[PDB]
Amino acid sequence: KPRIVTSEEVIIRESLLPVTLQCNLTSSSHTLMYSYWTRNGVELTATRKNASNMEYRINKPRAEDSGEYHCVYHFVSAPKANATIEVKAAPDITGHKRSENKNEGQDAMMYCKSVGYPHPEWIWRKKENGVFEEISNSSGRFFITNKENYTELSIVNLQITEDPGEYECNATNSIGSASVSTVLRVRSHLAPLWPFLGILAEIIILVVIIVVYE
């Protein structure tokens, strides 16, 4: 088994200093063919050389760079050795919908996608009386799905009197936590009736003024 010595894990802060990740193939009796860096199972571009010792430099480290890095060593007649250098950093929410407007008696969908590593734990909250409480499944109409980035909250058979409000994903991780908010509004069924009663109230007083004038 080839021996690979790797650099220590790095926590990406707001500092602009470039970060260098190092692997050294210290012991190998096989004719090495090539080597490459990989991030989250994706081979980084232009990282294939001889590289019996291999380096990767990040000039502007950001939270989007952090991930589970590997330096894979492919040999002529030996199985590959991968190893792992984890680059930890706090998570950041990169995508959400500002508001969700839906008719009563319909479904609602909200999501909070984020970037970081190690991948976070998604929990949702609901703002009541000025403070954020935990979501409650007290009617079986709430569905929460959790993934690495994606989280999804779904509501069925919206109720105008209870559901509307602001919800908040929470994205926690050993480095830190981040959160954003989404406003859900449920529209009444009798909405298109009040303006109609207005329009009539303008016609039957626009006529009255005219015919009296004649």
């Binding site: 509004r185 909405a191 298109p192 009040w194 303006p195 329009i199 007083i205 005219i210």
Partner: protein, 935 residues
């Protein structure tokens, strides 16, 4: 060849006589070469026309028509207002590629529409003018032939007022005088004669006399054809208004761009520290591009590109619709000048009367009949003499013809007073044929011509053996006093003395005149003839007459003019009458018309008094003397053709009254040339009008009615009104629009209305308001307002009150929405959106409300005079309804399926209903603002 004859007649001098004598002799020596029989004439057969016109080629082809549709498009493209729009579209299209392109197309579309419409209407107008305006007295045959055909050899009969259609050698005639200023530039009356100057020229006007001509050639080789081939106060005010609006719009656009750039730079660089990194240069220029485009679009909104289109559309619509009202317009600017008309100087006969002469009263047998009598009532030995003295007296060509069409009246063809006399004779159950047939020119030798100088026509007949029989018809005052006996009683020849005739004048003549009857007198004489009388001394050869009977002819006043004149006087227009009849008859008819009312102080002075009282210093004409007459003058009797001209000149040029006067003159005749051109607008007569009076006028009346003139006045006022209402609507829109932009750049850092939406608003307002508000049909309410002044401003008080009130309502609603729409609708605020951001439905609501308010205010902008019932007459103009409904549907589709390119997000049903609610509220606010006194 015609070329030799043309070169011969080109001399135009006293040498022509010599040449004609030295080479061509008289007319008949070489008339055979032209292939023409003078006395016999030409039947008018096609083979004869082909044989005599083997090398004619063609007639005078109409002008080349260099104005094609493409030429008109190019001409209308270089308009001052459209240059700005097309330049700005070019800048926008160039600046886009760096959906921005969707901006430029909008501007382009506007320009395209305008130019197309303009070109189309212009071309249409030209075709109409060619179609409407293209029997000639030069007939050849004894029967009249149509004007179109013109041949070489035809024998023209020329009368006073004929416009000469071709060139020809003179043959015979009496005292022919012609105005040749159309060719020489000299306005002196050339007297034509075989022995001095026998040529007759196309395009010259016959001022006096009559004759015949043998045309040298049909071929249009006359000097006038050769030279012709060789060849708006409202508009000024509107141009001034357009340039002022453009300047204000330019200033506002520049200020908006400066404010936006200042905000961006100060906020991004000074308040917050950000260095000018080169990598961010594209973003920093995209911002600038956006700001610039916003400014540009504001300018193209503020520029009024629909004003000239509105003017041309209203003028073309009115000109086309006048033709179905018996007015055909030649000069376009006369359509709107008639709106301001403040005086009309018409003539009695032809226009105010039906010009049909009938006999209703008589004074025969020393008895006054008010109705046509039985033939037995009148004693014998007198009826025969009356028939002899009427049938043979004058103008054997005044034949009476049956109508023979839909039971019409027996229209007359000759001198109308003599026609009425023949009608009276026929109504006595007699016939003039057994008298005229037995008396041809055979013994008819001594005839005195009829003219206004003598007002009488006399003939001598040789039939009485060893005697003569003089006949005379006179104006009851020139001729009546010349008689010496009365055929009264049972044929008795009582002695006529100055004593009893004075009482007779006040007994029968005065009541006849007061009934509106023109009084004429018939007299006869018998010369002994044993010594031949020397008949050249008119003073004595017309005396010693014997009056047979006195008859009063009449022509009824048209049934429509008593109300047309009333409408004219209600609309502030004063109408005067100029006539050649005696003062009594003129006053009697002017009372029936309504021109002068029985109780008032209105002058009715004659022509001689008029000339005497306006010339104090020798014969000089003084404006001060005229200014004391024309304000209170209604009837001008026994006038002269120059009297009408001097009255028009005195009225127009006067600076005495508080308001400048614009007059209209109705004319018909030879000498109504200068009087009909000094006036501001001239009306020629349709059927009774000569060619000289038709080529100097501005409008021609097809039906000859005076009541047509009033229609013209109405159709003038409508034109003005149309422009006014358009202006109203347009101004309101752009005011709000501009203000919104200038308040979007200060409170926020972006205009609430994007560039493409503002271009849609500009398209609606300018193009469609010009097309829809400028075709309003006229109503009878227009003829109830005093004529407008000269320096009256376009933006009247009510128009600016409407502009301010509706702008106030629209501005408050738009600002309230822009700042509280996130909470009123619960729709998430769209303010402070970053660059390249998805559209929101907070701003789509503002755009939709703006457009709906504009449409519901376009409905309001159809009333300028404070009228409350806006929907009055809305269905008489289908263009308005079509355009408004089409715009509404297009707005719906733009908001719904018109997303990211138009910056519009789809709306639900209640938001649409709220937008419509606010528009109808604009209608109700229009109702509110109408109940405010502008005084």
């Amino acid at each position: 060849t015609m070329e030799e004859l043309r070169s011969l007649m080109e001399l135009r001098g006293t040498e022509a006589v010599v040449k004609i004598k030295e080479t061509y002799g008289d007319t008949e020596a070489i008339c055979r070469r032209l292939k023409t029989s003078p006395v016999e004439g030409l039947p008018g057969t096609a083979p004869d026309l082909e044989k005599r016109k083997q090398i004619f080629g063609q007639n005078f082809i109409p002008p080349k028509k260099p104005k094609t549709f493409l030429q008109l498009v190019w001409e209308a493209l270089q308009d001052v207002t459209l240059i700005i729009l097309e330049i700005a579209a070019i800048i926008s299209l160039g600046l886009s590629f760096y959906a921005g392109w969707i901006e430029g197309a909008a501007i382009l579309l506007s320009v395209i529409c305008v130019v197309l419409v303009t070109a189309f209407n212009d071309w249409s107008k030209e075709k109409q003018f060619r179609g409407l305006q293209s029997t000639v007295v030069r007939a050849g045959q004894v029967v009249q032939i149509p004007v179109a055909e013109i041949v070489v050899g035809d024998i023209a009969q020329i009368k006073y007022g004929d416009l000469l259609p071709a060139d020809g050698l003179f043959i015979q005639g009496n005292d022919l005088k012609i105005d040749e200023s159309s060719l020489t530039g000299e306005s002196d009356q050339v007297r034509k004669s075989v022995d001095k100057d026998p040529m007759l020229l196309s395009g010259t006007h016959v001022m006096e006399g009559s004759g015949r001509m043998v045309v040298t050639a049909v071929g249009v080789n006359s000097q006038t054809g050769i030279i012709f081939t060789l060849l708006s106060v409202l508009q000024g005010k509107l141009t001034k208004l357009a340039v002022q609006i453009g300047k204000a719009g330019l200033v506002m656009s520049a200020i908006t761009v400066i404010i936006l750039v200042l905000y961006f730079t100060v906020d991004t660089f000074v308040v917050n520290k950000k260095p000018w990194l080169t990598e961010c240069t594209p973003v920093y220029v995209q911002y600038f591009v956006k700001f610039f485009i916003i400014g540009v679009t504001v300018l193209v909104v503020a520029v009024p590109e629909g004003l000239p289109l509105a003017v041309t559309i209203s003028l073309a619509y009115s000109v086309k619709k006048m033709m179905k009202d018996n007015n055909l317009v030649r000069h376009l600017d006369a359509c709107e000048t008639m709106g301001n008309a403040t005086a009309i100087c018409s003539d009695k006969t032809g226009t105010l009367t039906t010009n049909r002469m009938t006999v209703v009263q008589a004074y025969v047998g020393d008895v006054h009949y008010k109705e046509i009598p039985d033939p037995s009532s009148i004693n014998a030995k007198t009826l025969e003499l009356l028939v002899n003295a009427i049938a043979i007296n004058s103008a054997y060509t005044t034949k009476i013809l049956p109508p023979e069409k839909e039971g019409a009246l027996p229209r007359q063809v000759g001198n109308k007073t003599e026609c009425g006399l023949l009608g009276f004779v026929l109504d006595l159950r007699q016939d003039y044929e057994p008298v005229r047939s037995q008396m041809p020119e055979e013994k008819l030798y001594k005839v005195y011509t009829f003219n206004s100088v003598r007002k009488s026509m006399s003939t001598v007949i040789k039939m009485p053996d060893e005697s003569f029989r003089m006949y005379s018809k006179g104006a009851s005052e020139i001729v009546l006093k010349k008689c010496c006996k009365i055929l009264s009683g049972a044929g008795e020849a009582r002695v006529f003395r100055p004593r009893d005739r004075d009482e007779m004048v006040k007994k029968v003549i005065e009541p006849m005149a007061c009934d509106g009857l023109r009084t004429i007198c018939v007299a006869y004489r018998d010369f002994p003839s044993s010594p031949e009388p020397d008949w050249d001394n008119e003073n004595d050869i017309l005396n010693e007459l014997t009056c047979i009977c006195v008859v009063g002819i009449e022509d009824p006043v048209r049934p429509e003019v008593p109300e047309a004149i009333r409408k004219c006087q209600r609309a502030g227009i004063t109408v005067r009458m100029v006539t050649g009849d005696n003062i009594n008859t003129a006053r009697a008819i002017a009372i029936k018309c309504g021109i002068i009312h029985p109780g008032e102080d209105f002058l009715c002075l004659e022509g001689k008094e008029f000339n005497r009282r306006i010339r104090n210093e020798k014969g000089e004409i003084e404006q001060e003397r005229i200014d004391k007459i024309w304000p209170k003058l209604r009837v001008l009797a026994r006038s002269s053709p120059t009297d009408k001209h001097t009255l028009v000149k005195g009225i127009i040029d006067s600076t005495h009254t508080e308001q400048r006067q614009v007059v209209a003159v109705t004319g018909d005749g030879t000498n109504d040339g200068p009087a009909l051109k000094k006036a501001d607008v001239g009306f020629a007569m349709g059927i009774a009008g000569t060619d000289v009076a038709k080529e100097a006028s501005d409008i021609i009346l097809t039906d000859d009615n005076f009541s047509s003139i009033v229609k013209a006045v109405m159709w003038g006022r409508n034109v003005y009104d149309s422009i006014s209402k358009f202006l109203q609507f347009q101004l309101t829109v752009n005011v709000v629009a501009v203000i919104v932009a200038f308040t979007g750049a200060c409170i926020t850092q972006d205009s609430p209305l994007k560039a493409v939406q503002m271009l849609w608003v500009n398209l609606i307002m300018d193009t469609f308001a010009s097309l829809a508000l400028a075709t309003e049909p006229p109503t009878e309410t227009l003829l109830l307002r005093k004529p407008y002044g000269r320096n009256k401003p376009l933006i009247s008080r009510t128009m600016m009150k409407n502009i301010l009130g509706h702008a106030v309502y629209q501005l408050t609603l738009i600002f309230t929405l822009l700042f509280v729409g996130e909470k009123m609708f619960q729709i998430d605020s769209g303010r402070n959106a970053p660059l390249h951001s998805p559209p929101s439905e907070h701003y789509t609501i503002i755009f939709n409300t703006f457009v709906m308010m504009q449409l519901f205010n376009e409905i309001n902008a159809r009333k300028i005079h404070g009228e409350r019932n806006v929907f009055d007459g809305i269905f008489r103009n289908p263009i308005f309804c079509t355009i408004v409904l089409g715009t509404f549907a297009i707005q719906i589709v733009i908001v719904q399926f018109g997303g990211k390119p138009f910056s519009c997000s789809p709306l639900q049903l209640d938001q649409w209903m709220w937008c419509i609610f606010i528009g109808l509220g604009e209608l109700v606010w229009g109702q509110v603002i109408a109940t405010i006194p502008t005084s």
